[PDB]
Amino acid sequence: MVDESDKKQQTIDEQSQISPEKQTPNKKDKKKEEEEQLSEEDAKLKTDLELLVERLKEDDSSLYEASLNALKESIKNSTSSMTAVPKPLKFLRPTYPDLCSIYDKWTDPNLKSSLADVLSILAMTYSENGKHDSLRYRLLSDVSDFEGWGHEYIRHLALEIGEVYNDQVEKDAEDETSSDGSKSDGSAATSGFEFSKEDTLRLCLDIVPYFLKHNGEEDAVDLLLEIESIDKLPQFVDENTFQRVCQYMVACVPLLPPPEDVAFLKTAYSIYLSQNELTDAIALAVRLGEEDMIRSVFDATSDPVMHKQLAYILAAQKTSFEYEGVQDIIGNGKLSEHFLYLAKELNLTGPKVPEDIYKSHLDNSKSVFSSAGLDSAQQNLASSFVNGFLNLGYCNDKLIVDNDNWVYKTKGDGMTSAVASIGSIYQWNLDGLQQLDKYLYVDEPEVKAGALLGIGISASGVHDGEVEPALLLLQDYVTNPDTKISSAAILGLGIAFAGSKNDEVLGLLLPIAASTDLPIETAAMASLALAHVFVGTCNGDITTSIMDNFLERTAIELKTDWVRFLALALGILYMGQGEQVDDVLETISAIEHPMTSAIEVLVGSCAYTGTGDVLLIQDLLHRLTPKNVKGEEDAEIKSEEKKGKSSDKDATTDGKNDDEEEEKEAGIVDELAYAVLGIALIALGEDIGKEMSLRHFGHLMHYGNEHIRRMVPLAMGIVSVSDPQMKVFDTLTRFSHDADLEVSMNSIFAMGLCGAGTNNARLAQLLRQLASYYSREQDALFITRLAQGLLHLGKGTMTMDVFNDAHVLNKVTLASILTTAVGLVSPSFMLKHHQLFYMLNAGIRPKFILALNDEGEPIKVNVRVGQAVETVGQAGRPKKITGWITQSTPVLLNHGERAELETDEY
Amino acid sequence: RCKLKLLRMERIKDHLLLEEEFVSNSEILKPFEKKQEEEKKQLEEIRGNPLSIGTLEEIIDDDHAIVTSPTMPDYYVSILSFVDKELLEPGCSVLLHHKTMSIVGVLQDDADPMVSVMKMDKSPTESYSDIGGLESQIQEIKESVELPLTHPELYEEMGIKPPKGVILYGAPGTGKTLLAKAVANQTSATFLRIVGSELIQKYLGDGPRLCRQIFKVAGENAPSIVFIDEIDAIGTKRYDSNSGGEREIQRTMLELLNQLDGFDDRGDVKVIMATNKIETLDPALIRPGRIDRKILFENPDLSTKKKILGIHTSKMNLSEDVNLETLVTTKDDLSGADIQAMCTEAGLLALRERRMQVTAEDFKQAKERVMKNKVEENLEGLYL
C-alpha cells in the first residue's frame, strides 16, 4: 500500500495509490518539455490505463483523490488539449477519471460546480473520436468494481441527458448553457448519443429511455427501433424485447401529454409489426384508435397465407376482442372478398361466436329464480324489473315470460320498463325475439315501446358483420312521431352498436337531436346514442351534437334535467381519444352563460386525461367559487344555478375516473381515498351537493376497476341509510356484481336490511329492492368491468349509459335506462380450427408482483384450475395459459384480457 | 432498473392526497352545518370535563350497570340511551360523567400492551414467490387457508363447512415460518402471530389466559388468521418446576382445544401451526376436522433448488464468472435455508474484498462453509 518503488507490477500498484510516478509527474513534465515526446506519451497512455484498472479494486475515494490532483490541472495548463491538435485530443482518456475524482469522489461545492462544466465539453469533443465511448465501455463492463465508478458513470450519462433537458425548459439551447457549456446538436454530440445508446442497451438499460423522453418526438424512438429489431434474436430473445418496449409506453403515460403519448405509440406499433408476434401489433393499433392500423395487421396474417389456415381464424379472433366493436366492423368484409369459408369467419369476428360459447357455460351454472313475486300497487312495479335483474346475461326463464299477468298489471312508464327487463333475460342472444313480438302487436303503445328496449339489449351479441343488424328493426320506431316509441328505439340502437361506426347508423342519429327546439325530455336518448358511436375510436367531433346543445339551452331551461344529460353526452362522445377534445373544449367555452359554464367542466375532464393531475385541483377551485362570490354579498335563474352545482360534483369524480384507469393500476388505490374525503368536504356544507356525491361514488369504483371488492360498497351502504338518496345503493351494486356470489351475498343481506328493517315511502323501498337483485347472476355467470379486456387501462363504451345515470335524482324513467347491463366479459376458452368449447387448464393469480410493469402481467407460477371458468374480475384477473406439456401453445396472448384463446397443437 | 416512473406516479398521488385533505379541512370540513352544530349542543350537556373511565362488571337490563372504577368506588350507573343500550358488554371501558354517573358513552378499543404482542408492527413484505418452490405443498394452504377467505364462492358451491386449520411440519429451512406470513400479507386478514415460547411462562395459570385471549381477538375480527409459530416449544421448554413444568404444559394444550373449535362455535379462524415434533400435540388436535389436510415438508429437490437460489441472486450482483448451475449440483436434497445462507455469506466474502461484484468464487467458498455446519458441527465428521 505504502511507497516501495517501481520494480515489479505489484509495487507499482501500491506506489500509485499514494502518488504515481508514471502518470502525474511524467505526462506533465514531458508535455512542458518537448513535443517530439508526444510519441512517447502515446505509449505511456496504455500504461496509465492499466493503473486505473488495477485500482478499481480499492473502495476508497482518497487514493484517487489526492493522487491525480495535479494531473487534473495539466489538462489545460500544459496539454491544453490543443497544443499539437490530434496528439493531446487522443490522450484525454486517463484525464477523464481525473476530473471526476474531484467532481464526485470529492464534495466541495465550489469545485462541484466548476468541473461539471469542464467534464461536459470534453465528453462531447472526445465522443467525436469515439474513444470516449471505449473508455466508458471498459468501465461499465469493469475488471473490478467499487463505489466511486458506480456514481461517476451516472455523471457521464447525465452531462448528455442534462443538455437535452435544458433545451425544453429554456430557449437558450446548445452551448449557451452555463451548466454544460456544450451543445447537443450537430453530429458532434448527436453522434455521441446514438453510439452510447447502442452499447448501453446491450449490457444494461441506461440512457435509452431518457433519450426518447427528453427529445419528446417520434424520431427518438424511430432511432431506437433500428437497434432493437436487429437485437431481437441473437443478442436477446424476442420475448424480452417485447418487455422493454411495452414497459416504455405504459410507464410514460403520466409523462406525455396527448400528442406526445400517441407519437410514441406509433413506434411501438411499428416494432411489433416488424417482430414475430402480430398479436402484440393489433393491440397497439386499437390503442392509437386508428382504423388504419387495425387493417394492416389484419391483412398481415390473412393475405400472404393462401390457404384458410389457423391464420384466418386467428385474424377474426384478434378483431372480435373489442366489445366496443371498432375492430369488429373493420375486420369483416375483408373475408368476403378473399372468399374462403364466409359463414364461420364472419361470425367469429362479430359477437355471434361469443353467443355460442355462453350456452356451454350456462348449462353448468343453471338458472335461479328467487326474484320477487309481489302483486298489485307499487309492489308490482318493483318486482317486474327485479326478475330481469336476476337473470342478466343469457339465461332461460321462458315460462315466466309467457306468464303475462304481472307484465300487464304494471302501469305508466312501468309498462315500458317491465317489458324491457324481459329482454335482459336474453341479453346477448339472437333468440327471444318471438316473445318480444307478442307485446309489440297488442295492447297499449306503452308495452310496444318496452319491446324495443329489449331488442336493443339483445342485439349487443349479434350485430357486426351486418348480420341481423339492430338498425334494421329499430329505424321504423325512430321515425314514429310518438315520443314513447322513438325514445326507446334510439336507446336500443346506441347500446347495440356501441363504438361500431356504420354509416346507416350514423345518419339516422343526425336529424334527431337537431330539432331540440322541441321540448322532449326523453330526447336525451337522442344524443346518448350519437355520443356512443364516437366512443372507442378517433373523434369526429360532430358539429350536429354541439349545435343542438347550444340551441336547446337557449330554448329551454325548464327541462334542466334534459340539458344536464346532454351536457354529459358531449363529454362521453369525445371519449376514444383525448387529443381532439382539446379543440372542442374552447368551442364549448366560447359561449358564456352560467349555464354554459356547467357544460365546460365535464369536458375538461375528458380532454386533460392521462396527465390529469392539474385537472383534479382545477375541479376544487371550481368548488370554492360559488361561496367565493357569495361571501362578498354576505358581508329563471333557479334552474341554471341548480345545473351549475350538480355538473361540478359529477365532473370531479369523472376526471378521476378517466385518469386512474389510463395512468397505471397503481394510482387506483389513492383515488379511492380522494372520493371518500370529497363526499366529506361537501357533507355538512351544502345539503344539495351531498346527494349528488353519494351516487357518483359507486360508479367511480365501477369505472376504475378498484382492487378491493369485498369491503367498500358494504361499508358505504350502512352510512347511507341515514343520508338521503337510496339511489346510491343502485350505484354500489354495479361495483359489487364482480364474480357473482363472492361479494354479492353480502349485498343481498345488507341492502335487504336497510330496506326490510325501515320503510318510509314506497318509492325509497322500490330503489332498495332493485339494487339487491342486480348484483348477482347465479354462480359468477358473468363479471362486469369497464376495462376493454385488450387493454387493462382501457375504457368501454357500453357501460357509459350506466355512467350517465348517477347524475340525477331517481325517476321511474331512470328505471327504464338501468336494465341495460352489457359490457360482458367472455368466459376464457380454447377454440381450435373447428372451435372447441372448453379450455384445458389456466393459471390464476390475484394480482401481479411485478415492480417493473404496472398494467399487470401474470407471473409464471400461479395456481392451476380446470376448464369452463368465467374470467374472474378484480381479485383473479391475472390469467396465464396452461397447456405447454401437452403441446398446446397459445397464439393469442392473454394477460387477464377478455381474449378468446386459440391454440396450435404439434 | 428504470422503475423511476412508477415510483414518481405513486409519489404524485401521495402529494395529491396530502393537498386535498389539508384544504378540505380548512373551512369546508364540517364547520357550517346544523346537523353537527345543533346535535353537539346536548351532546356536551351530558358530557364533561372529566370522563372518568370505568370497568364494566355486569349489566343490568333497566338501563343501569354496576361499574367498579380504577379509583376504587363502585357506582350503580345509569345509561343515557343514545349510545345503544345493549352494545356494551363486560370488559368494556366506559365514560362516566363528572357529576352523577351516567354512561355518557362507551369506548370500543383500549390498547393493552398484551394484544400488542400478538398484533403486528411490521409488514411481512416477502409474500408469494419469495418462498418460491414447494408449489405442490402450497395448494394445501392456498386451497384451504388463503383461498376460502378470498373466494367463499367456490365453497358455496360444494356447500358444507369450509376448511379449518393446518399444521405445517418438516425439516428446518423449508420456509415453514415465512409461508404463513406470506399468505396473511396478501389476504390482509387479521394477522395475529404468537411465538411458541411465550405461551410458556415462569408464572402459572396466566399462561392459558394469554392463549385464551388470542382466539377471542380472532373471533372478534371476522377474517382471521392466527399463526402460532412454534408449538414444539411447549414440550422441550420449561422453567421452574412450580409454575412451568408438566402441569402448565397440560393446561395450555387443553385451553387451545376449546379455543380452536371446542364448544365455542366462534368465528372462522384459520390456524397455522409450525412444529417439527408432532407428538407434543394432543390426540384431540391431530385428528382432522379441526386441522383438515396435514402438510409434510421434505427438503427441496435439485430443480426446486434452482428456484430457491433464483430468489437470492436477483438481489446479488452477477458476473461472467458466476456459475449458478454448479452450486445446485453439489447440494443433494438440502434445505432452502442453506441456499439462503450461502448467498448471504457470499455477499460477506464480496464485502471483505471491498468489491461489489459477486462472483462464482465467492459462492463456492461460502458453499464449503455452509456444508461445514453439517460436517463440523458433527465431530465424527465422516460417519463412523
Binding site: 456514481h151 447525465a158 441506461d206 431518457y210 | 432498473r1 428504470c2
Partner: peptide
C-alpha cells in the same frame, strides 16, 4: 451501475 440507481433512492 445504471444512471437511475442514483435517483431511485431519492424518490
Amino acid at each position: 451501475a445504471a444512471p437511475y440507481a442514483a435517483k431511485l433512492k431519492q424518490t
